[PDB]
């Protein structure tokens, strides 16, 4: 309703719009990121809605830069502006400093947009509402592999393993049950796919999920259907 | 502050712009005004009753010249009328500056009506609460127009505005005649005002302007006194 401005605090000290946007996150398809010493693995349920749809057109994991990928959950159309800002940020950083932006810096630059919405004293081009999407930025910088979570409130945090989206509760509990700091990238990929298979409704197969990894050696890499098939076979 | 950007006049489920109807109610509660287009001129007359004798009746005029050849009068809210008079004089001068010719009456009426329309759609304003009678003379011809709060305008041979204007229009229908001269038109206009007038009319109770070939001019209290003595 319009009884309140978008910048109205609740009596409990929270912005109404941000809390509603978080509620919106809780309707997205489930994504899971796991950070290990050998790299970061991102996975996301595609949620095919019709067999006439082309699963390849569902892009839930995108490349921010050769060393940074992002998984997203919630209102995916809202994520496009944030993804473009992150990409432009990394390329501006490379242009100015002749070096690669750290995952934390990219996450910070994106999170600085979360609360930049409002109505009065706002020029055209101003956002009228918060973004209804949560992001998992996985990457590899001088500090090794890094996994970061950002939500609509602009708060971002480094995580060892994080689940976002509709089933994030059970997914997070399982991740806590299975994660150890010494696990290998293969172990993390297998565990993430097991958790996704568990929390998903449709049977997990090579077409209805997305899986990417970032490693110190290789750049951001999206698993092909055959690699996905090989990983799924051992589950 | 900056003004509100949203329109205060919007459509109702029945398709009416009710704020315009309410501004028209304000107009209908105004002091009576009359216009008559004669063969050789136009007469604008209006009741000018003061609340008390303390009012310097000759300090504020209801019949105003817009140009040498265009005058106007109103029914409704005085301050709104002053706004519209200032705008009309500005518009006439702009036309003169571009075309080096006195603005035709119809063109002035169209421009003023355009302003009035703008005030029915722009953000954070109400419509003007006035109706205007605009008289002019050009191309060897007299013109009488009415412009409403909605920005709609009509050409009239004779008309009445303000309180009791329906009876005034019936009276004008009965009395009016296309062939009558300007002095007969003045007599008819004063008679129309008399129909809805409370108390005795004096040269200080009503205001009269006339437009003809020479131009538009407000009549003096002595001339109105002569016309009133003749009317009796």
């Amino acid at each position: 309703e319009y009884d309140r401005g978008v910048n109205t605090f609740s009596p409990e000290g929270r912005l109404f719009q941000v809390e509603y946007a978080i509620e919106a996150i809780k309707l997205g398809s489930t994504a899971i990121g796991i950070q290990t010493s050998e790299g970061v693995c991102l996975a996301v349920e595609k949620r095919i809605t019709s067999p006439l749809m082309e699963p390849s057109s569902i892009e839930k994991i995108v490349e921010i830069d050769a060393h940074i990928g992002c998984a997203m959950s919630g209102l995916i159309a809202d994520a496009k502006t944030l993804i473009d800002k992150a990409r432009v940020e990394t390329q501006n950083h490379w242009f100015t400093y002749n070096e690669t932006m750290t995952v934390e810096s990219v996450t910070q630059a994106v999170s600085n947009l979360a609360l930049q919405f409002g109505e009065e004293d706002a020029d055209p081009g101003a956002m009228s509402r918060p973004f209804g999407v949560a992001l998992l930025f996985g990457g590899v910088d001088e500090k090794g592999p890094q996994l970061f979570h950002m939500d609509p409130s602009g708060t971002f945090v480094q995580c060892d393993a994080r689940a976002i989206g509709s089933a994030s509760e059970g997914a997070q509990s399982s991740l806590q049950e299975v994660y150890h700091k010494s696990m290998t990238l293969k172990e993390a990929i297998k565990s993430s796919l097991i958790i996704l298979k568990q929390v998903m409704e449709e049977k997990l197969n090579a077409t209805n999920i997305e899986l990417a990894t970032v490693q110190p050696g290789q750049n951001f890499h999206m698993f092909t259907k055959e690699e996905l098939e090989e990983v799924i076979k051992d589950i | 502050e900056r003004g509100y950007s949203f329109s205060l006049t919007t459509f109702s489920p029945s398709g009416k712009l009710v704020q315009i109807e309410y501004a028209l109610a304000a107009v209908a509660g105004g002091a009576p005004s009359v216009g008559i287009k004669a063969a050789n001129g136009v007469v604008l007359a209006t009741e000018k009753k003061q609340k008390s004798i303390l009012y310097d009746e000759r300090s504020v005029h209801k019949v105003e010249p817009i140009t040498k050849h265009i005058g106007l009068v109103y029914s409704g809210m005085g301050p709104d009328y002053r706004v519209l008079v200032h705008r009309a004089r500005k518009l006439a001068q702009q036309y003169y500056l571009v075309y080096q010719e006195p603005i035709p009456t119809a063109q002035l009426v169209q421009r003023v009506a355009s302003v009035m329309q703008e005030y029915t759609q722009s953000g954070g304003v109400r419509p003007f609460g006035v109706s205007l009678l605009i008289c002019g003379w050009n191309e060897g011809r007299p013109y009488l127009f009415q412009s409403d709060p909605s920005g709609a305008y009509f050409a009239w041979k004779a008309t009445a505005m303000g309180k009791n204007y329906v009876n005034g229009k019936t009276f004008l229908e009965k009395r009016y005649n296309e062939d009558l001269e300007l002095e007969d038109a003045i007599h008819t206009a004063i008679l129309t005002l008399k129909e809805s007038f409370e108390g005795q009319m004096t040269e200080d109770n009503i205001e009269v302007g006339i437009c003809n070939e020479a131009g538009f001019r407000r009549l003096t209290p002595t001339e109105v006194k002569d016309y009133l003595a003749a009317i009796a």
Partner: protein, 204 residues
């Protein structure tokens, strides 16, 4: 010099109950002729014409913008424009560019839409209007045209005599100007008709 870039000449003349407007036909760039049928006289009403000399691009731009404004004026007012009002409109248009002026010096010739009274006038490039009772001229060969018109013009000429006078003036004036000529077009405007003629002229 900027207005000598393309050359050209227009002239208008007043008769008894008629007007004449004439123009040379050459479109060239400095010394080179490009075409010999470039339009410099534009109708603005049934009995109202404007001739434009000077820079060809500004000739075309001013004619088009004037037609824009005149079309809007005649739609809004529901009547044909009077010659004096057209003169004022052109003056306003040109003065709007007071410090970026169009390089053209129009002449106007017409009859009153209601009285059919002759009207002619000329304007400088920033829009100063000059109404005259005999003749006006504009273009590179203005001095030559002034000589011819001062010598040949007479009051109260009938249309045939007006035609001969303006034709001889234009032909002999442009014959002494290198960058004007390549033909002459004349419009005689009367109450009942418009007569357009092209003259036998030197093509060098």
């Amino acid at each position: 010099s900027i207005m000598s870039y393309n050359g050209g000449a227009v002239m208008a003349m007043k008769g008894k109950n008629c007007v004449a407007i004439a123009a040379d036909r050459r479109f060239g760039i400095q010394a080179q002729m490009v075409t010999t049928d470039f339009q410099k006289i534009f109708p603005m009403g049934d009995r109202l014409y404007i001739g434009l000399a000077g820079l060809a691009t500004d000739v075309q731009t001013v004619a088009q913008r004037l037609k824009f404004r005149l079309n809007l004026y005649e739609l809004k007012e529901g009547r044909q424009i009077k010659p004096y009002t057209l003169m004022s409109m052109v003056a306003n248009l040109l003065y709007e560019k007071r410090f970026g002026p169009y390089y053209t010096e129009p002449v106007i010739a017409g009859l009153d839409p209601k009285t059919f009274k002759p009207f002619i006038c000329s304007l400088d490039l920033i829009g100063c209007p000059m109404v005259t009772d005999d003749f006006v001229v504009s273009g590179t060969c203005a001095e030559q045209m002034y000589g011819m018109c001062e010598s040949l013009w007479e009051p109260n000429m009938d249309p045939d005599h007006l035609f001969e006078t303006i034709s001889q003036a234009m032909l002999n004036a442009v014959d002494r100007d290198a960058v004007s000529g390549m033909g002459v077009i004349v419009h005689i405007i009367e109450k009942d008709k418009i007569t357009t003629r092209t003259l036998k002229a030197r093509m060098d």
